[PDB]
Amino acid sequence: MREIVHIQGGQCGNQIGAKFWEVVSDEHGIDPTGTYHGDSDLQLERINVYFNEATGGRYVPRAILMDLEPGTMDSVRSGPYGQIFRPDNFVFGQTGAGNNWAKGHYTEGAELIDSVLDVVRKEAESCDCLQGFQVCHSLGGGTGSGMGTLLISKIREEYPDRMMLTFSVVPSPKVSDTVVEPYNATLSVHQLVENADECMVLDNEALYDICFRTLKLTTPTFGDLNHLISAVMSGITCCLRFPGQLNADLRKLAVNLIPFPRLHFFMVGFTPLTSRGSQQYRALTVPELTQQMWDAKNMMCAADPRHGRYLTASALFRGRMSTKEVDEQMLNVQNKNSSYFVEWIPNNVKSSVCDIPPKGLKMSATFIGNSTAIQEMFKRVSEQFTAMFRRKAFLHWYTGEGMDEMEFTEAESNMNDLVSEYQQYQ
Amino acid sequence: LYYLLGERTRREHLAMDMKVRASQQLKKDSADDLYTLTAHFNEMRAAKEQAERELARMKR
Amino acid sequence: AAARERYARKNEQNELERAFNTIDSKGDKKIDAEELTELFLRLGHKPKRGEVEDMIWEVDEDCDGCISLLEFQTLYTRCRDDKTGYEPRGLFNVVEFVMNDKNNQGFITLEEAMQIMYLRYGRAELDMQLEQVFGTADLNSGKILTLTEFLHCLHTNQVKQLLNRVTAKT
Amino acid sequence: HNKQLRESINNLRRERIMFESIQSNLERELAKLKRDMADMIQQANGAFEAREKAIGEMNALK
Amino acid sequence: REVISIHIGQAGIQVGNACWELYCLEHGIQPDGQMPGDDAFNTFFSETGAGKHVPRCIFLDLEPTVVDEVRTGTYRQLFHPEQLISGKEDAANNFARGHYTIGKEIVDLALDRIRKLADNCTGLQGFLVFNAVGGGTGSGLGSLLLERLSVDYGKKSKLGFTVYPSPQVSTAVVEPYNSVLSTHSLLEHTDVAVMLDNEAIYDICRRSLDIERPTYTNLNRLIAQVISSLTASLRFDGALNVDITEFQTNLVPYPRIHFMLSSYAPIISAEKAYHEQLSVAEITNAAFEPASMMVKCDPRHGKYMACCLMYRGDVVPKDVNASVATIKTKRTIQFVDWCPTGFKCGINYQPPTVVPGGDLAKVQRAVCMISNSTAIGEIFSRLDHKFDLMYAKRAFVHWYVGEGMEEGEFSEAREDLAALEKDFEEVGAE
Amino acid sequence: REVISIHIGQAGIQVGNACWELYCLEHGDAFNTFFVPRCIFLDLEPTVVDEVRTGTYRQLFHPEQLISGKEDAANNFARGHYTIGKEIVDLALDRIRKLADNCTGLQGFLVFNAVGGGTGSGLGSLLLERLSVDYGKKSKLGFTVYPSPQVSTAVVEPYNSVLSTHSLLEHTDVAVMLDNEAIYDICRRSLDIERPTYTNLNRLIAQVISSLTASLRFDGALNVDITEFQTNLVPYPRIHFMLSSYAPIISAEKAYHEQLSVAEITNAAFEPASMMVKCDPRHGKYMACCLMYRGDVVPKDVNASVATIKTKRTIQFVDWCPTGFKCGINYQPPTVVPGGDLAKVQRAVCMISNSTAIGEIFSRLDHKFDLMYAKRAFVHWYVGEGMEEGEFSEAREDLAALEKDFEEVGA
Amino acid sequence: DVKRKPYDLLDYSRNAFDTDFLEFNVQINDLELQLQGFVNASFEHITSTEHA
Ligand SMILES: Nc1nc2c(ncn2[C@@H]2O[C@H](COP(=O)(O)OP(=O)(O)OP(=O)(O)O)[C@@H](O)[C@H]2O)c(=O)[nH]1
Numbered sequence A: 001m002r003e004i005v006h007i008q009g010g011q012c013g014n015q016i017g018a019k020f021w022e023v024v025s026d027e028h029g030i031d032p033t034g035t036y037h038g039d040s041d042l043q044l045e046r047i048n049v050y051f052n053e054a055t056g057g058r059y060v061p062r063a064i065l066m067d068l069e070p071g072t073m074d075s076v077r078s079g080p081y082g083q084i085f086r087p088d089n090f091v092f093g094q095t096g097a098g099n100n101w102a103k104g105h106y107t108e109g110a111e112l113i114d115s116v117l118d119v120v121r122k123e124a125e126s127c128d129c130l131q132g133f134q135v136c137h138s139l140g141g142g143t144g145s146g147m148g149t150l151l152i153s154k155i156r157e158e159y160p161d162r163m164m165l166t167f168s169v170v171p172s173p174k175v176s177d178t179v180v181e182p183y184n185a186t187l188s189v190h191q192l193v194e195n196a197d198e199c200m201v202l203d204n205e206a207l208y209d210i211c212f213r214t215l216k217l218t219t220p221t222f223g224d225l226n227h228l229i230s231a232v233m234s235g236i237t238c239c240l241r242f243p244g245q246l247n248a249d250l251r252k253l254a255v256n257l258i259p260f261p262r263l264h265f266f267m268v269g270f271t272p273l274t275s276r277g278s279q280q281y282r283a284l285t286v287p288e289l290t291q292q293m294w295d296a297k298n299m300m301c302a303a304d305p306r307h308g309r310y311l312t313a314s315a316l317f318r319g320r321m322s323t324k325e326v327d328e329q330m331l332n333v334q335n336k337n338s339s340y341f342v343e344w345i346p347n348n349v350k351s352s353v354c355d356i357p358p359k360g361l362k363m364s365a366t367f368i369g370n371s372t373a374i375q376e377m378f379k380r381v382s383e384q385f386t387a388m389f390r391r392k393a394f395l396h397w398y399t400g401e402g403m404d405e406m407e408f409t410e411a412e413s414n415m416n417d418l419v420s421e422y423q424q425y426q
Numbered sequence B: 001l002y003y004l005l006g007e008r009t010r011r012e013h014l015a016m017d018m019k020v021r022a023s024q025q026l027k028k029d030s031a032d033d034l035y036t037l038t039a040h041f042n043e044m045r046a047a048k049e050q051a052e053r054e055l056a057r058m059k060r
Numbered sequence C: 001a002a003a004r005e006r007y008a009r010k011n012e013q014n015e016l017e018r019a020f021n022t023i024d025s026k027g028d029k030k031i032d033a034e035e036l037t038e039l040f041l042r043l044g045h046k047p048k049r050g051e052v053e054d055m056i057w058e059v060d061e062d063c064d065g066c067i068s069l070l071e072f073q074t075l076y077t078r079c080r081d082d083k084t085g086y087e088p089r090g091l092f093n094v095v096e097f098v099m100n101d102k103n104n105q106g107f108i109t110l111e112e113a114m115q116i117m118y119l120r121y122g123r124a125e126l127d128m129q130l131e132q133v134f135g136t137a138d139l140n141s142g143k144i145l146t147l148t149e150f151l152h153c154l155h156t157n158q159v160k161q162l163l164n165r166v167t168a169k170t
Numbered sequence D: 001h002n003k004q005l006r007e008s009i010n011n012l013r014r015e016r017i018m019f020e021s022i023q024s025n026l027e028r029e030l031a032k033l034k035r036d037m038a039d040m041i042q043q044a045n046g047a048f049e050a051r052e053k054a055i056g057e058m059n060a061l062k
Numbered sequence E: 001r002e003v004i005s006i007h008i009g010q011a012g013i014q015v016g017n018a019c020w021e022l023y024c025l026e027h028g029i030q031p032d033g034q035m036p037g038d039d040a041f042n043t044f045f046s047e048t049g050a051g052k053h054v055p056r057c058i059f060l061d062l063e064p065t066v067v068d069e070v071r072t073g074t075y076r077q078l079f080h081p082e083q084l085i086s087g088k089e090d091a092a093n094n095f096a097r098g099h100y101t102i103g104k105e106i107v108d109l110a111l112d113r114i115r116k117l118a119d120n121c122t123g124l125q126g127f128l129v130f131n132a133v134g135g136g137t138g139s140g141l142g143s144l145l146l147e148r149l150s151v152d153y154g155k156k157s158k159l160g161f162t163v164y165p166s167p168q169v170s171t172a173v174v175e176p177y178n179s180v181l182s183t184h185s186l187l188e189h190t191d192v193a194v195m196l197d198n199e200a201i202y203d204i205c206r207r208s209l210d211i212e213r214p215t216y217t218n219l220n221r222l223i224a225q226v227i228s229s230l231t232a233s234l235r236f237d238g239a240l241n242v243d244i245t246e247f248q249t250n251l252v253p254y255p256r257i258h259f260m261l262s263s264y265a266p267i268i269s270a271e272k273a274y275h276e277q278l279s280v281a282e283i284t285n286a287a288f289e290p291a292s293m294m295v296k297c298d299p300r301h302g303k304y305m306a307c308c309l310m311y312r313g314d315v316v317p318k319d320v321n322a323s324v325a326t327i328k329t330k331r332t333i334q335f336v337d338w339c340p341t342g343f344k345c346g347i348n349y350q351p352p353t354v355v356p357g358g359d360l361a362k363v364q365r366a367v368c369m370i371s372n373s374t375a376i377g378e379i380f381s382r383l384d385h386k387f388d389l390m391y392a393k394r395a396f397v398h399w400y401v402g403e404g405m406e407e408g409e410f411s412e413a414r415e416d417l418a419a420l421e422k423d424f425e426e427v428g429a430e
Numbered sequence F: 001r002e003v004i005s006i007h008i009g010q011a012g013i014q015v016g017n018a019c020w021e022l023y024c025l026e027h028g029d030a031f032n033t034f035f036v037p038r039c040i041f042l043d044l045e046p047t048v049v050d051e052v053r054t055g056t057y058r059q060l061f062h063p064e065q066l067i068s069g070k071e072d073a074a075n076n077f078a079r080g081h082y083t084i085g086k087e088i089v090d091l092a093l094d095r096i097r098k099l100a101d102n103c104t105g106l107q108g109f110l111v112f113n114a115v116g117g118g119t120g121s122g123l124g125s126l127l128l129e130r131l132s133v134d135y136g137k138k139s140k141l142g143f144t145v146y147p148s149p150q151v152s153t154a155v156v157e158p159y160n161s162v163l164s165t166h167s168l169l170e171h172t173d174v175a176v177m178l179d180n181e182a183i184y185d186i187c188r189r190s191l192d193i194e195r196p197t198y199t200n201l202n203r204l205i206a207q208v209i210s211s212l213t214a215s216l217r218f219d220g221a222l223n224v225d226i227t228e229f230q231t232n233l234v235p236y237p238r239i240h241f242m243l244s245s246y247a248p249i250i251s252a253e254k255a256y257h258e259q260l261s262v263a264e265i266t267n268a269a270f271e272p273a274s275m276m277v278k279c280d281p282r283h284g285k286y287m288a289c290c291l292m293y294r295g296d297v298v299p300k301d302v303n304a305s306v307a308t309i310k311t312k313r314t315i316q317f318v319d320w321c322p323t324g325f326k327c328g329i330n331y332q333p334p335t336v337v338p339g340g341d342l343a344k345v346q347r348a349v350c351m352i353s354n355s356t357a358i359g360e361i362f363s364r365l366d367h368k369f370d371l372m373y374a375k376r377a378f379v380h381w382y383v384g385e386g387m388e389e390g391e392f393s394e395a396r397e398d399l400a401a402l403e404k405d406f407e408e409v410g411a
Numbered sequence G: 001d002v003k004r005k006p007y008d009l010l011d012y013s014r015n016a017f018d019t020d021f022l023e024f025n026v027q028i029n030d031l032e033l034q035l036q037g038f039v040n041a042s043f044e045h046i047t048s049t050e051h052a
């Protein structure tokens, strides 16, 4: 029916998506060789959203891997569920950006994104009625930020009346891998404010604290973080793949959650998330799900909403549940903590239910809250960017490649008006 | 422009259709009026046949 | 604003009837696509491959093919009161040019009379349809009026409200 | 797509022809019916006018 | 005496999956459509060929999934496939998208299906439409379909059983906009329109049906009982029958006041059934207490204009008339002055049946009350506060304006509903 | 009461492969009108004919009746009319003679052809010419396949269609138009086959043919023979091109749910969404209609249905014909073919009418033909085969006369 | 209003009075049609043939 193509950029995007296709294929019962082995008819009836039957029970994922280094692509086909992707979908450069956003947006982008667009165009016309596009990338890298950024701009110029998601991890001062993170973040977000339909703000700090306290893991490699992110992404699209009492497509959530067109950066959470010592001691009820859902520490972004107010919030529930519990729980969590919600919008929480849980659990949830606390992140990177730019450090790879001085001044100005308009609407 | 020309032309064609439907109502009821009114003419016709009949009787 | 329009119609009707006959070249009541090219040549403008077919197509809407004087008044009136109609105006312009012509090369200051009749508008709005200035006159022809009117109508038509909307501030 | 839109419009204009044609026939038929309405009314009225005359002369003669 | 039933949206056709299950079970029709005089079924089913029954209904929606489960459900055979209409993409809680973007191309097919359903009927009583005004599909093409029905038929009754967004229990955010823009046509297109809140049905089933965790299935079940109770007069003969053109005349004192509070009795569980006998006296009482109404509003703040009383089962006119007299002489409820008699009663012989798995007990006799009052005026004012509250800063209007709307209809529809407030208020005044 | 059927070309004999499968299945004295069959397959390419010779009906057809040439017509009217037709046509008609000789009460011949090809156009017209000389008075039922506007398999098919219709005016007496694009749309909309082939098309064409000849094979309440279409549907000697439609073309799932009766199927046979020709009969004015009824139908409701049609106003009638119908009722229900995609029905209706929408088709074809011909594209192939430059323009002017005839009569 | 405007009328150095004059020309025709209505309007009932 409605179809979503998948686009993974850079190293972070590629590895996030690899675990994503593994988890999804397990939900629909496709083995790593790409054949159907499920039992229920509910699994076979909605695999056209993410796959195409090739020949004789061969279901291939509708995904496009794109980056600038061969190591990532080889690491995809090596691991399991690596043999399911069509090899033509590996659009692929060779030289590399080197964490230089200009090289990802002006130097190397000019020779790859045309090739990327051919594969993307083929995957859009391969399906009938597009629901939207799904892009997983970072904001601190070069080949994920710049490459994915220019791709997003060109795509919105081609298919403008279609939805678009960008799952993006953002950098933070405590988890600081690259040195030019602020230059990449502020310019990348400057493009996201005018191109993306809605963006989902992620960051690595929150992922580390989820695996520290909630999951109580000892050695949380990147496989577990990608495992966490994949559960959230599968949750946002369960409504398209399984029937339920209250369905909510991507368009339904965006039109309902975004009160003003430029304010489309979200904070995400997921429930339930429990450690192996406490997976036995818990119950599975809607209120138990709700408090662990709205918890401050359980946000999958390191921006505490309790420093500000909620504008809108959304809940996507999965499993056999009673809709009265759904509605009364949203009403109670809004009445006790009444100051944390915006005032000139009553009933700031939209909720929906789907009748199919993730495999291995009786009942789960997914939270999408559009709060006003997100301006902290924009200031936290803006001051670092201004601190660097007022002495032109690290600028010659930017100005020597094609940027001028006015682009950084444009970035600050757009940065400053967005944090100012967040401040007004709060 | 063409997408809106089409809407104005559709409006014009419907304005004619509801007119055509109303015209059939006028056609039908007017036919009914002829049947009732010609019955009235026959009644007056019957009245005068009986009328000039009794006049001649009185004359003789 | 009605008085300008009613008075204008009262006088232009007689001009219009002769404008019609003059556009016809076969001494009949029907205006063929063939005649339109001859008229443009008189104006000194050239049609494109398919322009004439569109010109004949859009105006006529009670029958198909050649046009008739009855269609022509219907067009005239609808277009004249068309203002917020977003309606076609391909063949209105050529006839209005011919009627508003009395010099047999075009008209200069009479654009303002055309403009005021349509709306009082503004001197800046005049600087939109063309570049005429109050003190200076110009030479004009058929070429520079139809093209500019056609482009203006395309320019207004494009603008619509998607994310161009602007709400009062908080 | 423009050509597709063009054909749909031409269709509505062609559909108008037959409707307006049948409307002209209906006006003609209704005109014929209503003219007959006036003629038959007059004939009925003449019989009534004749009736009062005959009744008056009969009464007067007596 | 045929009436067709149309279901719009997810909530609409979900209500239908309860009603048609209930209907086939009443007339002994198997789920595959064949029966293993007796013309009572005719008002809903047309006998095709030999020994086969097809419902008189179309489901329609802009989203594929909610209609599709029905196609592959138990009732694959019952419904002709063409009836179940579907779209390609949802309106997404966007009234403009459902009234200007996607409705514009789905509703034409809808009406030319409706055309031959009406043609197959002979003595068409009316239509009945099922929609929730909070969403987009139910609101947008709902109002659009009503407008086109008014220009097609006009004189024929159009029973609209609408679900309004509840004050506190709510699932969406932009449903204030959806309700105002939809109401603006619900005024002058629906002949008879019944409101059904959501908090009322939730609160009823928590108290009376003693189900502490109710889902949508039970809600839809009791709605089918109400609908069945006012169509029992067409299906089965009774001692005192009322038809669908009686509400037109007896319940609508003014062409802009048609909004009725529904209520049902007795909502009693299986075990308490044993313990309490349910005679006509106590059930006529129970039909008026606000703890058993279908819309969460207080009629004590208002004065009744006219009431209608469906009675089902072994009810003689003697004691029901005595009970109606008893109600009018009490003073905990009051009537409008200019209307001396505020009632219209009706008795029908068949008792309401039970569906397997349902939560309604088997009862000797039941009452369905449909009244008209002024407490409806409080709901409109309560709705105006939170619609204007968000509109004062132009929140969410950018979606609707980009989808094809402007500023004129917000201002003009808002003030039209304001005029409607004045209408209710002026009538109340002596 | 016997009628013989000839099948020309790759399209004609494939249609015949469906027609005779249905006939033998239907008859398991009434069979005398068709039964060895009274047919001659004839074609210039032996590949499709030898499919019949090695098929399942190897024994049913007499060996000589299957006529097959030695080389193709190369999609050239000229080649299939003057070069290769001249060798096969004489053998074909020498067989039709003694088949008609075996018959006694021959009603007429009925021919199946497609005008886009070489054989169906070229020697199809040639065969019809010599039959008109030999018999003349006997009816010839021509079921042709004109090329669709937007769906096309060839390039020069405008040349063949114009050049075939020029002779199709004065040779066939009854001519039924059947496009392919329209039937594709029918099988997609009502029969819900998303991927149809030629087999499905040819199957429901046979259903139409069998419905209009069932009046001869079986006694009905109101029988209507082959001479009645000749008289009741052709108001003028140059207007014989008839729209066809059939109802109910319904899949098994839908048919059982639907209540099939005479009034609704009489309606369904008049909407443009269920005709065998892509044309808009709303664009035209009807001249005369003919309604074939099969199965459980009494004369009351067929008369009641026809009254409702005449009073509706979305479809208008001509002024020169107030009583524009010719109905016919037969008792035998339509038969089914195992593997066929149609379900059993109590009653079916085949409509064969005449309007001026066909006058629109010929102008639409003339434009495409006109465009290529002016710069003499593709003309040299036909001229080498034996034709000249003269006959293209003279055939063009013959279609021009036909366009004027439709505009004048409709006035 | 025309004879109170600042510009000198004989000077073509302004060339902005060409909108004042073409605004004047519409209420002059308005005055015309008003007087036409005046003639049509004071004769609706007349006491005598001779006085009127
Ligand atoms: N009574 C009742 N109400 C329902 C049911 N399902 C949904 N609703 C109501 O429907 C409203 C929202 O509209 P939906 O029907 O869910 O969706 P929609 O009307 O089709 O609009 P879209 O989501 O755009 O398709 C909510 O306020 C619910 O109260 C149901 O089964 N029973």
Ligand SMILES: Nc1nc2c(ncn2[C@@H]2O[C@H](COP(=O)(O)OP(=O)(O)OP(=O)(O)O)[C@@H](O)[C@H]2O)c(=O)[nH]1
Pocket: F008, F009, F010, F011, F012, F014, F015, F044, F045, F072, F073, F074, F075, F076, F080, F114, F116, F117, F118, F119, F120, F145, F146, F147, F153, F180, F198, F199, F201, F202
């Ligand atoms: N209905 C139907 N049409 C067919 C079939 N086969 C071919 N056609 C049509 O026939 C036309 C093309 O001409 P052909 O019939 O193939 O030509 P021909 O009769 O084989 O003559 P030659 O090919 O020159 O030997 C097109 O309109 C095809 O759509 C068929 O099986 N059924």
Ligand SMILES: Nc1nc2c(ncn2[C@@H]2O[C@H](COP(=O)(O)OP(=O)(O)O)[C@@H](O)[C@H]2O)c(=O)[nH]1
Pocket: A009, A010, A011, A012, A013, A015, A016, A138, A140, A141, A142, A143, A144, A145, A169, A171, A177, A204, A222, A223, A225, A226
């Ligand atoms: N969740 C997750 N994040 C990663 C992974 N690898 C790198 N990152 C993040 O990516 C950022 C550096 O981006 P990089 O991988 O160089 O992006 P790229 O070069 O554009 O592909 C760091 O802030 C990391 O937190 C991974 O396997 N999982």
